[PDB]
Amino acid sequence: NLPEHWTDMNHQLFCMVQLEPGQSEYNTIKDKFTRTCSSYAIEKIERIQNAFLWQSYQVKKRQMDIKNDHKNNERLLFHGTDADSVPYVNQHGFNRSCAGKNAVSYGKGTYFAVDASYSAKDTYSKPDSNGRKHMYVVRVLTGVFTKGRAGLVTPPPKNPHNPTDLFDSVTNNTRSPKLFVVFFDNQAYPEYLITFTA
Amino acid sequence: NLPEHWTDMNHQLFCMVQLEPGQSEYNTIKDKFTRTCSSYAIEKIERIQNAFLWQSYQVKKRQMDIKNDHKNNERLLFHGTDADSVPYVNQHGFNRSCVSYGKGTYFAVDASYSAKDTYSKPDSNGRKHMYVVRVLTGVFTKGRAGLVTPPPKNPHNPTDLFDSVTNNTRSPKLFVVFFDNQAYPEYLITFTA
Numbered sequence: 494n495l496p497e498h499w500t501d502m503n504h505q506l507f508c509m510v511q512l513e514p515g516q517s518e519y520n521t522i523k524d525k526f527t528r529t530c531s532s533y534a535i536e537k538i539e540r541i542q543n544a545f546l547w548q549s550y551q552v553k554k555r556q557m558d559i560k561n562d563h564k565n566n567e568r569l570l571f572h573g574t575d576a577d578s579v580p581y582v583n584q585h586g587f588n589r590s591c592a593g594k595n596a597v598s599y600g601k602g603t604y605f606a607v608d609a610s611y612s613a614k615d616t617y618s619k620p621d622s623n624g625r626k627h628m629y630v631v632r633v634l635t636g637v638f639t640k641g642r643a644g645l646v647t648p649p650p651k652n653p654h655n656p657t658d659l660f661d662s663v664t665n666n667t668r669s670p671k672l673f674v675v676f677f678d679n680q681a682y683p684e685y686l687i688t689f690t691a
Numbered sequence: 692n693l694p695e696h697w698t699d700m701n702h703q704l705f706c707m708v709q710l711e712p713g714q715s716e717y718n719t720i721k722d723k724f725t726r727t728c729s730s731y732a733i734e735k736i737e738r739i740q741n742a743f744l745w746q747s748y749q750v751k752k753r754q755m756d757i758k759n760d761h762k763n764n765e766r767l768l769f770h771g772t773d774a775d776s777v778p779y780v781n782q783h784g785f786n787r788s789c790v791s792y793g794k795g796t797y798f799a800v801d802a803s804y805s806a807k808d809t810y811s812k813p814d815s816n817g818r819k820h821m822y823v824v825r826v827l828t829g830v831f832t833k834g835r836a837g838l839v840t841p842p843p844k845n846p847h848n849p850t851d852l853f854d855s856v857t858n859n860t861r862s863p864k865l866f867v868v869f870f871d872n873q874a875y876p877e878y879l880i881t882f883t884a
């Protein structure tokens with residue numbers, strides 16, 4: 494079911510594709526980033542073609558689209574990480590079991606930012622030994638969300654008398670969301686990897 | 692692509708179906724349990740029909756069949772749990788976030804092991820609960836404390852991982868999986884000491 498604009502991988506299951514400045518695909522990501530990170534410079538933007546992560550993600554998206562009916566369940570968000578984590582995320586995606594405690598914790602899960610400026614902090618996109626910083630542009634199934642709490646290992650129930658019917662994700666603030674936390678595998682597809690510098 | 696032995700769901704996506712005693716399916720699952728638990732008393736066996744969990748599990752099975760280039764990746768194992776966890780597992784499956792061989796979900800080869808009160812805690816009326824689980828054990832290695840994923844098959848390619856870990860590779864008695872949708876709870880056995 495792979496997207497028809499992907500490069501042919503020749504029966505291979507994984508590839509990183511370097512994008513060209515001046516293509517709409519590169520420029521939309523550069524514009525989304527520079528909206529809040531004008532003081533940084535992009536080295537390169539790579540499209541992540543991961544057949545297995547895409548398949549599992551698209552199954553979860555179809556399930557949430559059925560369960561929620563006519564919600565926009567998917568947001569495009571940012572995730573800063575260290576160079577050591579890039580090979581794992583490219584191949585296997587975002588694993589809550591490896592996530593650090595956030596400085597403002599809304600639950601024990603993987604964090605995604607609305608603004609590139611948040612993810613660009615050195616605490617998330619740690620500069621490597623050559624001064625390169627790494628940030629993913631991620632399709633995230635935020636679905637129906639509520640304000641999180643530090644104790645959570647899953648999203649909370651919608652209704653306390655029905656403990657297994659859950660919100661899809663949590664946020665810092667439902668009125669003005671700046672971060673989302675997800676608690677399940679294959680709820681986030683790493684779509685682009687931005688390499689950038691001071 | 693819902694399995695033939697499932698019964699019609701009237702256009703719903705989740706239902707727990709009580710099995711008829713003395714019919715082929717009930718006898719098959721009862722025999723797997725009584726192989727090691729013949730001193731227990733079975734109250735009922737329920738088939739778990741969870742379309743979404745099944746879909747996600749079958750995608751991972753197809754992916755592991757391609758990755759390993761062989762179709763011997765699945766085992767039928769047991770998982771004992773407390774009654775308070777049963778509604779969650781029925782709807783959402785197994786969650787490592789809820790451990791001597793790693794921080795994953797544990798499954799036993801023998802029902803007798805899952806039948807310990809430490810796992811299948813008797814509820815306020817004496818009832819114990821154990822799942823029969825399809826688990827994608829795939830290619831496995833010995834586990835150890837503090838793993839958050841299986842080890843790499845060779846640390847020259849650190850992201851090509853084992854599928855699961857065990858207590859003993861030659862004669863396994865338990866398996867640990869570390870990812871969502873690597874286990875599908877197929878039957879729930881309600882029983883007593």
Ligand SMILES: NC(=O)c1ccc(OCC2CCC2)cc1
Nearest residue numbers: 770771791797798799805810865
């Ligand atoms: N819930 C279960 O049925 C269960 C729990 C634990 C199991 O192994 C625990 C290992 C550490 C000492 C052996 C197997 C199965």
